[PDB]
Design a protein around this ligand. Sequence first.
Ligand SMILES: CCCCC[C@H](N)CC(=O)N[C@@H](CCCCC)CC(=O)NCC(=O)O
Ligand SMILES: CCCCC[C@H](N)CC(=O)N[C@@H](CCCCC)CC(=O)NCC(=O)O
Ligand SMILES: CCCCC[C@H](N)CC(=O)N[C@@H](CCCCC)CC(=O)NCC(=O)O
Ligand SMILES: CCCCC[C@H](N)CC(=O)N[C@@H](CCCCC)CC(=O)NCC(=O)O
Lengths: 181, 182, 187, 182, 181, 178, 185, 183, 185, 184
Amino acid sequence: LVPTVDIYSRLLKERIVFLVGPVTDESANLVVAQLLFLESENPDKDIFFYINSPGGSVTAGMSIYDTMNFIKPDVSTLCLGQAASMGAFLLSAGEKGKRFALPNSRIMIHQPLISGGQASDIEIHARELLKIKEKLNRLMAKHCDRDLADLERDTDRDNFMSAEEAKEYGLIDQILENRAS
Amino acid sequence: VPTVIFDIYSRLLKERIVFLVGPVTDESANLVVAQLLFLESENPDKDIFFYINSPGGSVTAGMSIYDTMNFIKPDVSTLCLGQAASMGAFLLSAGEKGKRFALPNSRIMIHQPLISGGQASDIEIHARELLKIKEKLNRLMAKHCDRDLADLERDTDRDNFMSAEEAKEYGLIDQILENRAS
Amino acid sequence: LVPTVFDIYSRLLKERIVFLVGPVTDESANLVVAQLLFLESENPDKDIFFYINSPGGSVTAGMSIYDTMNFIKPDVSTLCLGQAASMGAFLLSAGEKGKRFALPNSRIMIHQPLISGLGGQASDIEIHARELLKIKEKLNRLMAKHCDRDLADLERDTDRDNFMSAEEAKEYGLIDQILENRASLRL
Amino acid sequence: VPTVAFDIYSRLLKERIVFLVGPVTDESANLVVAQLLFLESENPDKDIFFYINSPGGSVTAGMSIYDTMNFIKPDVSTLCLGQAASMGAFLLSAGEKGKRFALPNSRIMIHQPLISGGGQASDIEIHARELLKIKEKLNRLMAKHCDRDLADLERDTDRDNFMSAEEAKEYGLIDQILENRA
Amino acid sequence: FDIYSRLLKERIVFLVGPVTDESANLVVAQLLFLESENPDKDIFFYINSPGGSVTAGMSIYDTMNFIKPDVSTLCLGQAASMGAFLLSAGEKGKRFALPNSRIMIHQPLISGGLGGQASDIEIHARELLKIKEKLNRLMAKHCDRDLADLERDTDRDNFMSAEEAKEYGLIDQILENRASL
Amino acid sequence: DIYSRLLKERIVFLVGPVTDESANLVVAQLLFLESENPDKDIFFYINSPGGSVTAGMSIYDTMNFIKPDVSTLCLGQAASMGAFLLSAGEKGKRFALPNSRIMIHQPLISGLGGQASDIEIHARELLKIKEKLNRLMAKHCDRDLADLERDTDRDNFMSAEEAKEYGLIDQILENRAS
Amino acid sequence: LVPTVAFDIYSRLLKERIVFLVGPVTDESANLVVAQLLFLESENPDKDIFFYINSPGGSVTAGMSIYDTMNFIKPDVSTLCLGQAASMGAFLLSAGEKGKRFALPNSRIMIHQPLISLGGQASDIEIHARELLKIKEKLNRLMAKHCDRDLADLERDTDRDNFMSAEEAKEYGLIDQILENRASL
Amino acid sequence: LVPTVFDIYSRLLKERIVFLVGPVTDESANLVVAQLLFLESENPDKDIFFYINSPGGSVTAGMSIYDTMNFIKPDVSTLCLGQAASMGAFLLSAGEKGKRFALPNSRIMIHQPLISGGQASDIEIHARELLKIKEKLNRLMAKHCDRDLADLERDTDRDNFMSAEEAKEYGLIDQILENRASL
Amino acid sequence: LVPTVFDIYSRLLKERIVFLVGPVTDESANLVVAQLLFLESENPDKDIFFYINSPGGSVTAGMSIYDTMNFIKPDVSTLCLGQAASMGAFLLSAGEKGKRFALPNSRIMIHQPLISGLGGQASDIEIHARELLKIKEKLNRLMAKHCDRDLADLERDTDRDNFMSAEEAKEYGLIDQILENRASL
Amino acid sequence: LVPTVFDIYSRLLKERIVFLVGPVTDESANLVVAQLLFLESENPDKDIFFYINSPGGSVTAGMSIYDTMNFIKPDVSTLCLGQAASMGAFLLSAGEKGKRFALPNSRIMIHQPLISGGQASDIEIHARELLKIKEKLNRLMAKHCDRDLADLERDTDRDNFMSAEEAKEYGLIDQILENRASLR
Ligand SMILES: CCCCC[C@H](N)CC(=O)N[C@@H](CCCCC)CC(=O)NCC(=O)O
Ligand SMILES: CCCCC[C@H](N)CC(=O)N[C@@H](CCCCC)CC(=O)NCC(=O)O
Ligand SMILES: CCCCC[C@H](N)CC(=O)N[C@@H](CCCCC)CC(=O)NCC(=O)O
Ligand SMILES: CCCCC[C@H](N)CC(=O)N[C@@H](CCCCC)CC(=O)NCC(=O)O
């Protein structure tokens, strides 16, 4: 269904990587592979990471996040459509100064959720989920240059933000209307 | 259900026998509760004989039976036939001490609570409630069995099957009945 | 599936005992309503004993029970066995004050209204969301009255699932007394 | 279910005939138990006739019947009609010795316990050990019922073992084959 | 009373539809009841059945031979497989069919056979062949025929009219009305 | 294939429901064409019943972000988000074929569940979406917000001529001489 | 589904001697890893292989095919946990050449005893229960070896699901270093 | 997706490596047969390396592999990685004697045949065929393992799991290879 | 589900009316058989009124009714209300000659046997096909007798579904009279 | 799914090897037909090697292969590997006489036609046609096996399994090939 000249491989030659739809092990690892490839091609030029995602798996998302921070090139992020949950986490993780959103994109942040067995096992997994919640708040607070207490308050339930609101919050640096913004 | 000059379960209810058979649900538990209250109304001082063949089930449903057993005036004698596992074993052990029995090839099993959520805040709320249930049931079981809390904690960490003799050794029942001569 | 002695529930209905067991539906709630009206007709002056073991259910169905409990002349005493959660806890706390009881290992739980993500046009979602919040506010106000507490307490205490032991429910003001046996009644 | 002011099974319950038909479940087994207890209270001095046509089923449900047969005062005579397989054959062989019968074309089948339907290796170990304990107990009890050496039962239950009425009598599972009332 | 309980007062017992543990034991129960009511009067066993479980059918068969009353059989509609076996098992001289009844006999079949280790399949195949031999031997006795004839004539489905069943030895008479006796 | 060949003519199709996948494919093609030549018009042919609002906005913001003019053409139909994108084409370069149809309406949601607090949060966000889309649509159509609110309360079907009078498109093309 | 660069992106990274295990370990996904390991050894037995693991675990025998192949071939198999390495995934992570086992800073490890999602005669359940316990004992013995820890430690720490941060995994002995970025040699 | 270098499996085929992975079906077995014939055609004298990670499967499907292994001129060396169970273990044990290998943590399992309906006559026919297969497989397994048939009948009555070392002790394989210096 | 005036069908059985409604199955046919035997036991000389509204069904189930109607002493009068198709029309035509009726807007349909699902070996399919052809001929012969027609007539006229009005059914010989009300008799 | 060397099957087609694997369907049989015609076009005089591992399937699909085998100029040698059951056994037995082979542990099975409704008239028509099929298949098989028709009628009444040796004695194949030295 993807046109040829495929189109995503052609845009990859421009150092553009897309994350579209739910963050899964497969879709996240495909992003990781493209990031490693682009670094191999030129470790010094910026990579442009376009995000339209409702979120997904935390560990899948972390594999992208850690790869973004590991590789040498700056990873610029761009929100188009929406960046929610892990998508918003990855958006805010772009190189500071190079995190963008289009004017009508939507950001949403929230605490982790689950889609059990013995009480002992439920205890273990609840404790792990609470560590994830705590780690994500701390990393998000760092990304946004905000207090940990703010992130805890502001992710207790679904928190939708416009592009201007996400910029004020510290999740992105600039809103781009066109190539003059 | 066979009938007599009343169906067979109503007939045995005339002898103050109440059955708990199969999984403990809100409905099956409350039918037992209703029978216990009925028997107390009929005669508040005569023993009731509570026959249990159950794999367990809902904790709150079992607690409605348990608290009713302790609330009503008559002693509730318990008898394990077939099996008393999980909430079934809890109710077996809750019978009036001295009047908890098992038939010779009955089986007992005890274990910690099991279940089969959304936001982390809610999962935390329900995990903490589940752990309080786990502690409460161990504390109550230790009292029933005349044992230390630490013993019940180790012995319910995984499924713990017991023969009738072992359940007697454990303190969960008082006597094994082979016939009316024992 | 139900022993006769009249079956056992009809027999206890003669003792003026009514059960609410399991989820609260239109059918199970109206059956409670019918028993309440029947007992009032049998004797408008004698207490009724309403035994609740329920995880909750439909709010409008539970409200049909609530309004009937307050409408009829006899006092409706409530007793929690097993659990009274959500609409179950609301009905328990609605018993005649002084006559709300729980058994020692009962569990109470309160929370804000929950839905099974509405559907349709934004105008319709706005209408149903506004009604859902109104329901939430009304239930908090009624619960505040039942518990003899400030509205702000109930707003705080229902934001997420709030489990209570019998002791906690008594201290909250949701029940009056915990009964281990028939010697426990005081006051 | 025909009516004769009773249904047909309630009517034969007046002749002290109790049926076990189809799979043994908690529900079907406890119904048998209730009938055994009912008959005992009606007259503890008369035999009970326990007619078995069953492919087997739950071991613990079967033990609830077994232990009740041994507990109550009346002799429980057993009759195989059609078939008594697995727990059905166990109950058949558990009848009062001297009063265990089969009709001429009935068939018996015995075998070791099987499970139709998981977890951690620790939990699988616990349940496998319990299954072997059941297997050992059933071999010991079957050997006693049949007046045979334990090694005989271990060998002969390793896989499905079908027996004709005559073979079951020679094995010791029943006492006599009844062709008619003569 | 319902209609079947009322006809039970006339010592009429029906076997209708597949032979199962439940349907067969209900027949057994009625046969025992009727014997208890009067051990000397014939019982009239009306069969309209396509067959079913062999061991269930044997419980009826052995009960018919055990009780004191003669059990007269009547085929109405059809008596196939275990139904034809039971029809042929009524007291000799008192086995009847209505004129347009149909009988069918065949060797045993298993719905979904073969399941497990070769050892278990061997055990169950041998039991099935013993059942096959026993049914042929018993049927030959019912029909006053050779075991070899029953083996030949049941290898595949063998449909018989009432007159053919009478000639074969499965029934004694065809009754068009009460004067054909 | 046929679509890659027409992409060489700077023709991009949106056909069927707007999803994350179908919208981003459009985005990728728009970015590709800008990279091939940032100055030449792009021709965005729309035959769509609508779909996801955020997916549609990714197309919308990309149309406005890239340097080339994006001309739009309605063939068959442009409904809901499809009509939104049609009206977003470069002004003066928004077209419909003579028997195409337009339809506009307020946001819809399919289904889930949650606490009253969460439902309130999401209803408020849906109402903000509704107003933003009415405001943007009014700007595209050179009409008032109150007009768009009134005219999208329920499904509003428009012929090509009605859509031109409304301001959603500039011209109806029977052929290249229109 | 997969970008091209003449090669799909994964074939291209295989030219950098990078092999991925992503998602559940199955017979098919494990043998694909085995095939890439043998291919890279054939292409150059003198260069390290970089085995990137993001997996929740899966089949024990399929995982053992990877494990024994890693140990069989000449090249060092360096391992990297990205995302998570759970169960058989953590086993393979810890099996990388010692000194060359890595995790990214926010990856997570989880270890536990074998589980099954049994049926037949009691004899058969006994046979398979014994085989499952042998697997449990072997995996504890091998894991204790990878981690340079006492067997009793692994027996205690795998009784139930045991999650570890990257730092905890390093202290436990499952990995050697946590990699922040290319400050590397 | 299979990596490309040729795809990765074709590339390993050029080094005379053939895989049997997952259940033995008509389709998966014939693909192995086709590779064996191709490799014999490429060089009839050089060993073929048959890597087996399989839980077993169809008996006739396996026999087509077995008979091809015995038919072609090249020695077919076998290697168990992961597991060789049932028909998988049969083919593992069918490798050229002296060239049957296992990796150290692979496992073998052997057992009698199993199946996953009709007139008694037809069930009799199929039960007899199943018992002939059982006896034939026991006879061929006894030859592969250099053991008495009675040993094999006893040892396959139920699932019989073996470590690599037990499989070597049994006679099913020749050596366990930790690496190429294990030779 | 049935008004208990003791339900209405039990009440009409006191007037010696038996209904066949819907598909003829073993269970519904034997229920008819039992009522027929019951009414004969109550009084062997009084007419029985057999009201048929049926689309047909099982041939052997229908034959149990047919043979019982002919076996018992009472005349069995038949009445078609709504429709009598296939085995239903067969039973209608089987009523005591002179006492077979239809209501004015009743519908009759006759046709050859059909089978729902044959599946087995060619040998078994031959056996079952032959039995079906035997059934087809016997039913045509019996129907021809009821209608005072030839077997060849019935074979011709049942080859495909043959719908008949009440008047057409009377002309054919399937019924004796059409009753608008009792004055029709 | 299929290694390249050509994919592996196209590579073996270059050596005039054609496979029939798994159930015989319209699609699988016509692919065999297509290969047979292609090999004849490539060289009408050289043997074709038709390798069969099949449980059977559609009779009409199998007949399209059968008639194509007899129609083309090249001899079609057949080899049973694994099994040739029902239509598979029929096609195996249809190879050029003298050139029908089996591997030592192959299995052959033969039997009468099977069916996995409508008016009685329609059942009569299809029953008669099925019996015609049964008779025709027994007649052709008796010719292939150089045997009396009555033998085939007897020996296909129920599922009839044959070892390779039994199939050779039956006349279904000519030789059993242990390895490349087994040939005449
Ligand atoms: C744990 C208990 C679960 C259910 C009760 C839960 N506490 C609160 C709740 O569900 N309130 C709804 C009424 C309950 C009936 C089923 C949804 C309100 C309503 O009427 N909504 C209609 C609309 O506005 O569309
Ligand atoms: C056309 C239909 C007529 C069917 C009658 C058919 N001739 C005979 C028949 O049903 N025999 C089996 C009984 C059925 C039980 C299966 C659920 C015999 C049996 O139990 N053998 C041992 C075993 O099963 O293991
Ligand atoms: C849609 C119109 C329905 C009318 C039914 C249709 N006229 C005829 C019909 O039902 N024939 C079979 C029903 C008899 C049931 C006995 C088990 C007869 C039969 O037994 N044939 C041989 C075979 O079954 O093999
Ligand atoms: C183990 C069993 C497998 C072998 C099957 C067995 N040899 C015979 C077989 O399949 N015969 C049919 C042809 C196959 C068609 C498949 C869709 C007969 C037919 O063409 N009937 C049409 C009619 O008369 O209406």
